Amino acid sequence: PGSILNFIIDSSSFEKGLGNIAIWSKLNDPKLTINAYLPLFTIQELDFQRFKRKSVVAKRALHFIDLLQDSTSFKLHLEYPELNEAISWNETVKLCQQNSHTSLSQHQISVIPIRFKKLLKSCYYKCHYKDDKGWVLVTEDDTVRSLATQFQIPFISVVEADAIINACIVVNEDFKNDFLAPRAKGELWT
């Protein structure tokens, strides 16, 4: 029948799960397609981690993303930087207010850091804004996970995305150490 996974990949998923993503990028399955969407947030936050926090994994992640060419299954898509600017914040905020029974105040919305607002707009754009359906944010950051729940953005972790991909090929409701790509490390139920 042919399965198709639509993932929005966070900055922290690259930092903690670069090894997992590099393994997905080489998948050659005709009955599996992974569309990896990298919002402006992902590149900007990896750049911040690299230059401001001096992260060696953020640099490795940026070099990998820069070289990465599409596979039979793995399709990379980087969000055009100006596209994020055209997404409405007022429309993005409706997801938090309207259908969310547990909501945030008008002030709690305004204090959300600029970078997370950009990530939320990309998530609203792919998940709620109206083949290219079932967009799920792949994240390893808890402050991102709380905001995704508030704004009704479906999300999964790298180990969860791994077991989903693994099934498609599940239900969940020291020089040598530094050389290997970081691998994500919870437990899934079947």
Swiss-Prot record:
GO terms for cellular component: cytoplasm. One of its GO terms (biological process) is nuclear-transcribed mRNA catabolic process, nonsense-mediated decay. It is found in: Cytoplasm. Transmembrane segments: none annotated. Keywords: Cytoplasm, Nonsense-mediated mRNA decay. CDD domains: PIN_ScNmd4p-like (cd18717). Involved in nonsense-mediated decay of mRNAs containing premature stop codons. This is Nonsense-mediated decay protein 4.
